[PDB]
Amino acid sequence: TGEFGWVLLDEEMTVGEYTITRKNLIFPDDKTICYIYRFSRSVSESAETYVSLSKFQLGYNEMDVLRKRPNPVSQTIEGSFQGLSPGKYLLKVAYEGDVIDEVEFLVRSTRTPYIEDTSSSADDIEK
Numbered sequence: 001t002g003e004f005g006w007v008l009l010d011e012e013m014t015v016g017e018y019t020i021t022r023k024n025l026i027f028p029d030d031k032t033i034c035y036i037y038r039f040s041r042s043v044s045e046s047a048e049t050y051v052s053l054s055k056f057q058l059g060y061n062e063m064d065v066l067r068k069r070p071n072p073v074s075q076t077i078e079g080s081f082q083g084l085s086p087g088k089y090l091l092k093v094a095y096e097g098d099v100i101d102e103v104e105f106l107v108r109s110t111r112t113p114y115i116e117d118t119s120s121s122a123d124d125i126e127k
């Protein structure tokens with residue numbers, strides 16, 4: 001299994017700067033969300049690699065896909081998302097035709113914290 005890592009950037013990069021995790025990802029809407037993906041196997045710079053991002057509405061809907069060129073030494077791809085609207089997102093990684101990994105994250109308006117155990121999309125703060 002591969003690994004996702006993240007760093008938040010103020011508009012106003014090295015592998016060690018990223019925080020490696022795929023759980024409880026909650027990002028603000030005023031920082032650029034930068035990710036790295038480290039493949040569990042070795043990869044070729046010429047192999048067809050894509051990411052897609054989907055936004056949750058009535059279930060996830062694909063926003064678009066983007067061709068990525070792997071770094072074959074670090075075995076990574078990297079990207080970033082500027083200006084996503086608040087919501088729930090699904091990032092998928094495809095290699096040579098197959099989806100090989102995916103991860104969810106939330107984007108929230110910078111106003112009132114998200115309580116991990118009690119928050120829901122249908123409460124006064126999130127809605």
Ligand code: NA
Pocket residue numbers: 057058059060061
């Ligand atoms: Na749908």
Ligand code: NA
Pocket residue numbers: 080081082
């Ligand atoms: Na982008």
